[PDB]
Amino acid sequence: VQSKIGSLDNITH
Amino acid sequence: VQSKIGSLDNITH
Amino acid sequence: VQSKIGSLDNITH
Amino acid sequence: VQSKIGSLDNITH
Amino acid sequence: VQSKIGSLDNITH
Amino acid sequence: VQSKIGSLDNITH
Amino acid sequence: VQSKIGSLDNITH
Amino acid sequence: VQSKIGSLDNITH
Amino acid sequence: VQSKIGSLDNITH
Amino acid sequence: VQSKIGSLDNITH
Amino acid sequence: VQSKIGSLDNITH
Amino acid sequence: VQSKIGSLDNITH
Amino acid sequence: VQSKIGSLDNITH
Amino acid sequence: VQSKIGSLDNITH
Amino acid sequence: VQSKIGSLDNITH
Amino acid sequence: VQSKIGSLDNITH
Amino acid sequence: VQSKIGSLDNITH
Amino acid sequence: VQSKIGSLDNITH
Amino acid sequence: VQSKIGSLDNITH
Amino acid sequence: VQSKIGSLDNITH
Amino acid sequence: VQSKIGSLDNITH
Amino acid sequence: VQSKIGSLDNITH
Amino acid sequence: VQSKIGSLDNITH
Amino acid sequence: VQSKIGSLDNITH
C-alpha cells in the first residue's frame, strides 16, 4: 500500500 | 495498491 | 490496482 | 476481497 | 481483507 | 485484515 | 494515476 | 499517484 | 504518493 | 485453498 | 489455507 | 493456515 | 461415519 | 464418528 | 467420536 | 464461511 | 468463519 | 472466528 | 459396523 | 462398532 | 465401542 | 477435512 | 481437521 | 484439530 521497491538483488559478477 | 516496483533482479555477469 | 511495474529481470550477460 | 480499494466517495445532503 | 485501503472519504452535512 | 490502511477521512457537520 | 479533479459539486443558492 | 484534487464541494449560500 | 490536495470543502455562508 | 491469490512470483534460474 | 495471498516471492538460483 | 499472507520472501542462491 | 441415529423426537400426545 | 444417538427429545403430554 | 447420547430432554407433562 | 459443515440441527416448535 | 462445523444444536420451544 | 466448532447446544424454552 | 476381519496376510515361507 | 479383528498378519518363516 | 481385538501380529521364527 | 477417519491401514515389508 | 480420528494403523518390518 | 483422537497405533521392528 503506497509503497515502492527500488531493487532486491544487485549481483555484479 | 498505489505501489511501484522499480526492479527485482539486476544481474550483471 | 493503480500500480505499475517498470521491470522485473534485467539480466546482462 | 470484500473491501473498498482505491476509491473516492463523496456525499452531500 | 474486509478493510478500507488507499481510499478517500468526504462527508458534508 | 479488517483495518483502515492508508486512507483519509473528512467529515463536516 | 496522473489524474486531476477540478471539482465534483458546484452549488450556488 | 501523482495526482491532484483542486476541490470536491464548492457551495455558496 | 507525490500528490497534493488543494482543498476538499470550500463553503461560504 | 492451496492457491495463489493476487500474488507475484518471480523465479530466475 | 496453504496459499500465497497477496505476497511477493523472488527466487534467484 | 500454513500460508504466506501479504509477505515478502527473497532467496538468493 | 459408522454412526447410528435411533430417533430424534418422540412425541406422545 | 462411530457414535450413536438414542434420542434427543422425548416429550410425553 | 465413539460417544453416545441417550437423551437430551425428557419432559413429562 | 457462514456455513453449516457436518452439523446436526433439531428444532421442535 | 461464522459457521457451525461439526456441532449439534437442539432447540425445544 | 465467531463460529461453533464441535460443540453441543441444548435450549429448552 | 458389526463386521469381522478373519485375517489380512497369511504368509508362509 | 460391535466388530472383531481375529488377526491381521500371520507370518511363518 | 463394544469390540474386541484377539491379536494383531502373530510372528513365528 | 484432510483427515483419516474410521479407516484401517496395514503395511508389510 | 487434519486429524487421525477413530482409526487403526499397523506396521511390520 | 491436528490431533490423534481415540486411535491405536502398533509398530514392530
Residue numbers in the entry:
A (entry chain E), B (entry chain M), C (entry chain U), D (entry chain X), E (entry chain P), F (entry chain H), ...: 350 to 362
From the paper:
Functional tau is most abundant in neuronal axons where it binds to microtubules, assists microtubule assembly, and is essential for the structural integrity of neurons and for axonal transport. Here, we identify a new amyloidogenic segment, PAM4 (Polymorphic AMyloid segment in repeat 4), encompassing residues 350–362 of R4, and show that it self-assembles into amyloid fibrils. Cryo-EM revealed that PAM4 fibrils are highly polymorphic, and, remarkably, that the polymorphs formed by this segment in isolation recapitulate the conformations that PAM4 adopts in polymorphs from different human tauopathies. In all cases, the folds share a C-terminal β-strand (residues 358–362) but differ in the way they orientate the N-terminus about an intermediary GS-bend (residues 355–356).
We also determined the structure of PAM4 amyloid fibrils formed by a lower purity (92%) peptide batch. Two-dimensional (2D) classification revealed that this peptide batch also formed multiple fibril polymorphs, with three distinct PAM4 fibril structures that could be determined to high resolution. The remaining two PAM4 fibril structures were determined at resolutions of 2.7 Å (Type 3, 15% of the total population) and 2.9 Å (Type 4, 13% of the total population), respectively. The Type 3 and Type 4 fibrils share similar structural properties including crossovers around 80 nm and containing eight PAM4 subunits per layer of the fibril core, differing only in a slight re-positioning of the inter-protofilament interface. The resolution of the maps, in combination with liquid chromatography-mass spectrometry (LCMS) data, facilitated the identification of an adduct coming from a minor population of the peptide containing an N-terminal Fmoc protection group from peptide synthesis (~7.4%). Similarly, stacked protected N-termini pack at the protofibril interfaces of each of the three fibril structures with the C-termini extending towards the anterior fibril surface, which could potentially explain the additional structural morphologies resolved in the presence of the Fmoc protection group. Interestingly, the folds were interchangeable within the different fibril types, with Type 1 contaning FoldA and B, Type 2 fibrils containing FoldB, C and D, and Type 3 and Type 4 fibrils containing FoldC and D. Additionally, FoldC contains an intra-subunit salt bridge between K353 and D358 that stabilises its highly kinked (>90°) conformation. Specifically, the FoldC conformation of PAM4 stabilised by the K353-D358 salt-bridge is also found in tau C-fold protofilament polymorphs linked to Alzheimer’s disease (AD), Gerstmann-Sträussler-Scheinker (GSS), primary age-related tauopathy (PART) and cerebral amyloid angiopathy (CAA), while showing reasonable fit to chronic traumatic encephalopathy (CTE) polymorphs. Finally, FoldD PAM4 matches R2:R3:R4 (4R) tau strains that are associated with corticobasal degeneration (CBD) and argyrophilic grain disease (AGD).
